[PDB]
Amino acid sequence: DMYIERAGDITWEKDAEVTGNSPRLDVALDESGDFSLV
């Protein structure tokens, strides 16, 4: 039996670490809700 517990509020942060790129990808979604890379 799963259970949930609080982890914090939903609020934007002004001075947050900025990491990660912006890749442009062609993707195909199967019927099972899983993405593939085509």
Partner: protein
């Protein structure tokens, strides 16, 4: 507990975090593969599934999907990453694009353990524009999750 905010989805080998969810307006939003539609406990304590969809990989408890905001396509977003056993950390990034035949959907190129999937993605007004945790593994081995949003 039903106040708004982000919540960890746990299970008892030991207490393991299988995913992350968001509570808003009395409804618990998370991804389908996290709970597989099974009922959740919030104290004592029972959250029952209300709406779900495997293709969207989303599921709502105690009510319909309430998160309506979406990515504007230009400004940077913030992933409120809640990794297993680690304090919630806001990670700003500029999302990519997932080119499908039903259109384009935003995707963030941030890597976190599988227990982090279900964590919300925020716009500059703190509105949830989607959840993190459904994506692909690209040609290098890194993980890129789409900004999966439901319909209110």
């Amino acid at each position: 507990e039903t106040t708004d905010g982000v919540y960890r989805v746990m299970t008892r080998l030991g207490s393991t975090q299988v995913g992350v969810g968001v509570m808003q307006e009395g409804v618990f939003h998370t991804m389908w593969h996290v709970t597989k539609g099974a009922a959740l406990r919030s104290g004592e304590g029972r959250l029952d599934p209300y709406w779900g969809d495997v293709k969207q990989d989303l599921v709502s408890y105690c009510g319909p999907w309430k998160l309506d905001a979406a990515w504007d396509g230009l400004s940077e977003v913030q992933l409120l990453a809640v990794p297993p056993g680690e304090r919630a950390k806001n990670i700003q990034t500029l999302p990519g694009i997932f080119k499908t035949k039903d259109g384009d959907i935003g995707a963030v190129a941030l890597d976190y353990p599988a227990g982090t999937s279900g964590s919300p993605i925020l716009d500059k007004s703190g509105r949830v524009i989607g959840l993190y945790g459904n994506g692909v593994v690209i040609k290098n081995g890194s993980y890129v999750s789409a900004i999966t949003q439901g319909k209110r």
